[PDB]
Structures are given as C-alpha cells and as structure tokens.
C-alpha cells in the first residue's frame, strides 16, 4: 500500500536511554497491508519492525 500524505511529527521526545521519543505519523496509504518502517540513520532506533 503506497503511502502519501507523509505528515510526521512528535508530541514529546526525550533523549533517554530507552524509547523516550514517540512520534506521531499521520499518513494516507492507498490500501490495507503491511508497511516496512525503518530508521535509516544509526542515531535513531525504532523499536518496531
């Protein structure tokens, strides 16, 4: 499902040890299905595949 409307932001982040950032993605995919979410930069570690 191709996503458009890639409008992301974060309510509140915190550079903790653990996942002290949690960001909000508003989006528009085309249809139903899985999506590969990925942190390209080693500075950020998404905990979800």
């Amino acid at each position: 499902p191709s996503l458009t409307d890639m409008s992301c932001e974060v309510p509140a982040c915190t550079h903790s040890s653990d996942f002290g950032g949690v960001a909000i993605i508003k989006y528009a995919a085309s249809k139903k299905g899985k999506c590969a979410v990925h942190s390209m930069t080693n500075a950020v570690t998404i905990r979800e595949a």
């Binding site: 509140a12 949690v22 909000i24």
Partner: protein
C-alpha cells in the same frame, strides 16, 4: 472582667486560635511547596487522545 479582646480577636492575617492544645490555625501566609511523584499509571499516550 477586663481581659477583653482574646487573641482570637487580636490575630493578624486572619489567624485563629484553638485550645486543647492552643494552636494558631488558618493564617495561610507565604507560599507552600509540595513535591508529588506520580507513576505512569495516570498518564496516557497522546494517540489515546
């Protein structure tokens, strides 16, 4: 017969006196801090909002 105005009546800032034992109540002057710690049992995610 001429003790007169008891310290209930002589009280600045709206103090009040109370016997058994005597005590100065309810002249709330100054500023009182309170530290209160609360766990994440109360806070909910903004995506739940």
């Amino acid at each position: 017969k001429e003790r007169g105005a008891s310290l209930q009546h002589t009280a600045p800032f709206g103090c009040q006196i109370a016997t058994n034992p005597v005590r100065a109540m309810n002249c709330a002057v100054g500023n009182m801090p309170i530290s209160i710690d609360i766990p994440d049992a109360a806070f909910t995610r903004v995506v739940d909002a």
